[model samples]
Target: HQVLFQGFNWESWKQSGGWYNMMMGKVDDIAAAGVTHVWLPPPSHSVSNEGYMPGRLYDIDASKYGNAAELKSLIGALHGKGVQAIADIVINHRCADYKDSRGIYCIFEGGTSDGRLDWGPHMICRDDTKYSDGTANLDTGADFAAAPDIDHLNDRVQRELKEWLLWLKSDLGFDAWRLDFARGYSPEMAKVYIDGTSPSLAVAEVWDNMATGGDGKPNYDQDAHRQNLVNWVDKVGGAASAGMVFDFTTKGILNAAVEGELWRLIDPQGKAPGVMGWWPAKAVTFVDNHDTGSTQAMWPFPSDKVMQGYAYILTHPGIPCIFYDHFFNWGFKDQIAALVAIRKRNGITATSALKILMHEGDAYVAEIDGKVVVKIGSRYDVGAVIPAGFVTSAAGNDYAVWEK
Candidate 1:
């Protein structure tokens, strides 16, 4: 499945795009742009906080965006167009509650917690923990607020997650799942949940060696956590459990190679153990993604006439994913059409050409099918001087079928 363009800031999309434009309308637009799948936002219920970040995932607030029925319609429409839909599933934690009791809609009922900051929940004492106390203190993050971290150790919570997964399959007809903060949950529970669900397509956001750190301290043993997820998948035979990582380490290297150093190579340097090379066919490769981008980020390289980055990703090993902004918004349609045709012609027999023949200034050359495709920066040097049958003459910078 191709990715949802994540650069659209959360708030802007919430207000302007909403459920209709962002979900259904956006899916149609992407399908027209030659994508086969449309990945949507978290469809489960949650509490709305400042700037639209959910406080927790208990029940969905339909009035804020669109109702659940609308979401179901969007997914069904996408399915009708031969476009698969992947929804975000967050089981890590819920939006913390600000009140000492259960949650309610703000300003409607007009009950009181504390008028000042004194009433919000804080993780001060052991009793404040979710495992200890069944509820969370809402005073933690809000101005007068509390957010509760759900207890994954709770069987009830696990059961709820399983129920939701089934809902995704039976009700929504979702093709896959994008597990949010995957490391926070247990692998045993995940396997149980995965077994219960029908369609077994899910990707976890498990960080092998990296994590979100704060206060100059590492929160957990980063290596063990990541390895555990991988081991569970191997044991369970699911979508490789956290097998297909986001390719962040490789993505970091790619952006660094393209814009920063130019001395480094992006594609499969060596096995980073928990990275894209963890397995063969399941590896997901890309140049830039939502979380990471170059300074200019005029991705797949700065233009369509030149697709050195594109050639590398398309011709290389692993599952190739194209960021939508470049694949659509930035005018890569015609050039990507060329790639789609080439892939169809070649099928899965394509291999990564790692032998670096030339890397000077903005120009780089590499061999694919034993012939070279050369680019001076992001522009393919049409009719560039090379060995016989290296680059065939084609319209603009699109490829010509060359012989070795």
Candidate 2:
């Protein structure tokens, strides 16, 4: 909740760091880089979904990461050095294409539907509305070729999941969780886990597609899901708690600002004469995440120059998360130190908040209270600033800081 250091969780944190070395060296590396929190992939025993693999919550998939003990040690190492360890939890669905007797399967139901030989265990809706076969098969595919939606509507499934979640909280010192597909699961089922265990922070990964409106129609609005998730978590009350919804819509804008295109941040259409009001500081901002190479990949240039991007994201408001790729690969430690100082110096966290005063000429001057903090020109002029405050001077145009 507070302004901590930029944190990240990689899918291969265990294998690449190798369990043994991670408890000592890799954890130290994260703390050294001023990362107050470090998150890792699901330490659960999950089916190897192509992208993020589904597995059991307690057991370790030794073939890929490691066992339970290794995960414990990794968490211990992080906590020992004052870094918070966040664990990823996939409650949305499990892999139906993979073999797991205990796992729920969809295609195995009473039907000779969709062809194929060896079918992995999966859960598919048997209701008339869900599938043409209506019997609710456990072998047939569900949403996609990979994701197998869990039968959260079932009481037994809900109880098992809640128990696993509670164990993760009581035994492991996980400060928070990054919900795999927060909205994918039923709200009632989500509450069973969140309200019972109650981790310090629970951030949902509610992407744009699922953000449906009250009319039960899909509008495909960018921020619709984000607002709904945050609101839903709050409504669930003490039973289901959630904080920090991913502002995917705003991330594009912040990335554009980092690239020195302030106009793009305001103009949703990216056309001439952009919109007037824009507030990016309030949203969770990032450069590159596990999802995709956002700003870093969009540019034709070879190097990401991620530090410059961080400079832009950090100087603005809201909590900024650092990608593991940028820290371990790109020399971002020094860049972070410079940016951190400016963030603290100007009270940028509260005082230098983003607000749109005017939007015209493919350029805009974002202000806070009444003072202009940033003047983004039509051109991508590196280190452009407003006269009232904000000054840019660094080795790589890392940051610009001043008092209002």
Candidate 3:
């Protein structure tokens, strides 16, 4: 039942002051909201201000977010608030330190302050297409069109990245990792890194395409899409130590459900549809995130019904992720907190026994662990169906919570 909060939005890097310090200022509200973990942005030196195009993995001096010591302090403060930090590990690609003679950004000569190895063109994947000089090994997975994809097959690369992950844990005190663009490398490599670092939690951003269903048409059924996530989670960590997946399937399906297709919330198995239905323990369900609901919304959720979406995840099985804007910027902190409090008081968790009680055109009701029931829909009197012995607990626009 660990609640996660995306502490920063896409525009959070624009804080003229230190972003880490700004986050430190919000620790009171964050802790008060019962956030167990904060998914932080990449704390490395990057070419881009957002810290995605990492220039030096070890040198965390310059970034739009904050410097090394500042990041450490922020993490310390979060720890004080009983909130762990989830590092945004961007290992799929890296910004080179210098360009080669061919004008390609593949020559990486920067090393750590504490004597780490300096990389060369060979570190780049041969199939990167942008850089001609690379190792004999081909790219492990898909190629990132922007930066040179790291050659995860190289022994040195693997060792150095593992060491870097260990540093992020032992040195920086990061409790978990939110792996970026995980599909750009081999799932085996992800398993190796997670096993080597042994962070308290590890979640991969293995976001796959969801358009092409049968006969190359629009995909109404996202089973194949979520299966990709399940396959990645299965390969990364099977029992419990392995990483989890950002449940994009849940995001998409939940959005659709709020758009008057509430029936889609139930699947053929008579359970909650989406990745959480299959792998709740490994599914990090979210309605909106930095990329999805921020300034640059590639796939934004329906803003009007976001609370309904929150009601669904906050009361269901998967570990729910709260967005920065929705919880703080937007006017839903109290409601979100109320729902989360109810969930906590009733002992709902990632493995809660969730039964889809109702799935109609305008209503989606779920009974969790036979104790708490949630009803979310456009129908005004949706809660009238709740029989006796179930007392009302919480209610919001198009959503209601009850306990028996």
Summarize candidate 1's per-residue lDDT along 242-351 as a digit string, tens digits: 33444444443444344523344422343322233344344456656443433334333334333555655555455556665556566666665565445434443323
Query: Deviation in angstroms for 386 in model 3?
Result: 1.8
Number of residue pairs clashing in candidate 2, backbone atoms closer than 3 angstroms, sequence gap of 3 or more or interchain: 28
Error of 2 at 252 (Å): 2.5
Best by lDDT: 3
**Ten contiguous residues with the weakest lDDT in model 3:** 211-220
- Candidates' lDDT values, in order? 0.46, 0.50, 0.84
Candidate 3 C-alpha lDDT tens digits along 246-338 = 999888787767888898888887866678988899899998888888998978888899899999999999899999889888899999999
Q: Give residue 147's error in model 1 in angstroms.
A: 4.0
- Measured on C-alpha atoms, candidate 3 has an lDDT of 0.84
**All candidates: TM-score:** 0.65, 0.69, 0.96
Total backbone collisions, model 1 = 13
State residue 61's C-alpha deviation in candidate 3, in Å. 2.0
| lDDT tens digits, residue span 267-371, model 2 | 444321111122222244566666655232432211444565565455655556677657665666666666555555555552244665434443444554333
Q: In model 3, state the lDDT of residue 208.
A: 74
State each model's C-alpha RMSD to the native.
Answer: 8.3, 8.1, 2.0
After superposition, candidate 3 runs with Cα above 4 Å error = 101-103, 110-117, 132-134, 212-220
List the candidates ranked by lDDT, beginning with the highest. Answer: 3, 2, 1
Of candidate 2, the 10-residue stretch with the lowest lDDT total is 271-280
